[PDB]
Amino acid sequence: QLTAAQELMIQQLVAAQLQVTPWPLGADPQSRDARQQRFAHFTELAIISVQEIVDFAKQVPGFLQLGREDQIALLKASTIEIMLLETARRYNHETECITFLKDFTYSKDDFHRAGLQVEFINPIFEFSRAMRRLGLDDAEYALLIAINIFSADRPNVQEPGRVEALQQPYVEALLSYTRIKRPQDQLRFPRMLMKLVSLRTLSSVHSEQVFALRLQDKKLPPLLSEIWDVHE
Ligand SMILES: O=S(=O)(c1ccccc1)N(CC(F)(F)F)c1ccc(C(O)(C(F)(F)F)C(F)(F)F)cc1
Numbered sequence: 001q002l003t004a005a006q007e008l009m010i011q012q013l014v015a016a017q018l019q020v021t022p023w024p025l026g027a028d029p030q031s032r033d034a035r036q037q038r039f040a041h042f043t044e045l046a047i048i049s050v051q052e053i054v055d056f057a058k059q060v061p062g063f064l065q066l067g068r069e070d071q072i073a074l075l076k077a078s079t080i081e082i083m084l085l086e087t088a089r090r091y092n093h094e095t096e097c098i099t100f101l102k103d104f105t106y107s108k109d110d111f112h113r114a115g116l117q118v119e120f121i122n123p124i125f126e127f128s129r130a131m132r133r134l135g136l137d138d139a140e141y142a143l144l145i146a147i148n149i150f151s152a153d154r155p156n157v158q159e160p161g162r163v164e165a166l167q168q169p170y171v172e173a174l175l176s177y178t179r180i181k182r183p184q185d186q187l188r189f190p191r192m193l194m195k196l197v198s199l200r201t202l203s204s205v206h207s208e209q210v211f212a213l214r215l216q217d218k219k220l221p222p223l224l225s226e227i228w229d230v231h232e
Pocket of ligand 1 (some may be wrong): 039041042043045046049083084087098100106116124206209210213220224
């Protein structure tokens with residue numbers, strides 16, 4: 001059984017988890033102004049997602065207690081990973097679209113029309129598609145978000161032992177939650193760890209998608225820019 005202390009951390013997380021420039025209508029796909037406006041749209045969707053991800057972290061017990069520079073380094077690393085996680089949650093398997101809202105849905109071709117490469121769009125859609133077979137519930141997603149944020153090995157983490165100590169009760173809760181929910185499915189927890197590793201691959205591919213877009217003269221807005229640009 002889950003201990004009281006685990007049922008409490010899950011509930012806080014779930015409760016905490018409860019808490020634009022228009023697509024260019026009928027513009028040519030080859031059109032450069034249209035490709036810029038599609039990019040700017042996604043960019044603005046993405047800005048609302050870091051906002052909500054930063055507001056969610058502030059509510060994870062311990063996070064605000066951490067070094068200001070560690071907060072930022074933890075948020076820097078995991079933003080794209082958490083966005084990817086959420087995209088998967090919201091994927092419409094009938095329609096083959098990542099949904100942001102409800103009338104805001106995007107196919108592979110939508111992303112291509114914004115100047116993105118198949119090298120990035122294909123693996124994001126495959127990850128979304130493969131997440132349904134895992135059948136995660138609210139609590140499992142939330143636990144996974146919290147463990148993703150408390151990753152001791154991110155670039156520029158100055159207090160990794162503190163970060164790991166904060167992670168452990170969440171990994172431990174997740175383990176026991178999976179054993180309770182699916183006693184017969186002993187591959188479930190390792191599958192969850194496998195997604196974490198996928199997220200680090202897709203975070204890396206996202207980074208080079210951002211770089212290539214710079215070579216096409218497409219610049220991220222300041223807020224996203226400080227998260228994702230490389231510069232020497
Ligand atoms: O799901 S996203 O976060 C997303 C962003 C905006 C609108 C809808 C969905 N996303 C796809 C992913 F699967 F990776 F999560 C996404 C994130 C970031 C980007 C970009 O960084 C930018 F600039 F558009 F925001 C880029 F296009 F450069 F890759 C594009 C798509």
